Amino acid sequence: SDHKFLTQAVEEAYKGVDCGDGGPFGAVIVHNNEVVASCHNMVLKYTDPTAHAQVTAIREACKKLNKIELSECEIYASCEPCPMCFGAIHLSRLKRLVYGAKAEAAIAIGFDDFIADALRGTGVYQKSSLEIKKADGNGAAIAEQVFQNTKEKFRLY
Amino acid sequence: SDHKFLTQAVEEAYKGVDCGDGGPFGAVIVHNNEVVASCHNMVLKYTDPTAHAQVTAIREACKKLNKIELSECEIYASCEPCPMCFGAIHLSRLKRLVYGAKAEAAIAIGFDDFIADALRGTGVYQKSSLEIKKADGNGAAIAEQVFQNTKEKFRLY
Ligand SMILES: [Zn+2]
Ligand SMILES: [Zn+2]
């Protein structure tokens, strides 16, 4: 079931970048094989620098379920969550995080080297207990190629 | 000018708790001695675990200035920003952060031990360039007293 929801996140990223909502990032929040929220980066549409794919998905899932905690749901991120999105994932009480592409795949096309210490385990004050899975195989390949595909769809300006 | 805007952030914290919007946290975003945003925690009001005081202040400052970067403004936080809010402050490019109370003052009344390595200078992956000032003297007294005065007035989240 992981592959289906991670691919849906990659499809959210492509749709969002295509319609100009924001960067090529998508996220899907799943409650026990049922999709609760499916969104992409909305920074340019919302004029909100905090409207990343993960944060947007969390806001919409929490509105739909009338709760501020998602301890029964899991989040699928087309790309490794930034420090802000990882913090938001912690606060949301989400029980599991699956992500497809390493932050370096996004850095390769000009994004900030803005990596979450708590996700990679390099923190002194911030420790994460959350279950984290880096996608492998085909899911990782699909997520990983998103950034070169969108840089070359937009290369000729 | 720091004490005046920090005091306004503390006032926002008290407002939000009194009207039930959220926890005792407030934030003020200032552009060149003029207030662009003044907000408090809206987690309970919005059913949104990302609606901290800093995040809310940022979205509203970006709506008022209709831009997704705040490199000319500064933020005053009644309490030390968590990893999510500090990440949002990084992404917003805010140039200065003044905060009143250490996170431990909020932890003492039941909040998560949720501390931002990049703020305290222990981050490896997350590099912060903005100037950060922890308030002392009366600013610290006011910000710390927020938590003993609001004890058992609000719902913990
Ligand atoms: Zn992010
Ligand atoms: Zn916060």
Numbering used by the authors:
A (entry chain D), B (entry chain A): 29 to 185
Which statements did the authors publish about this structure?
In plants, guanosine deaminase (GSDA) catalyzes the deamination of guanosine for nitrogen recycling and re-utilization. The other involves the hydrolysis of Gua to guanine (G), followed by its deamination to xanthine under the action of guanine deaminase (GDA). Both deaminases are zinc-dependent enzymes, which rely on a catalytic water molecule to attack the amino group-connecting C2 atom to proceed with the catalysis. The zinc ions are tightly bound to the active site, coordinated by the completely conserved residues His80, Cys113, Cys110, and the key water molecule. AtGSDA catalysis needs two key sub-processes: the activation of water and re-capping of the active site, which proceed via the two critical residues Glu82 and Tyr185, respectively.
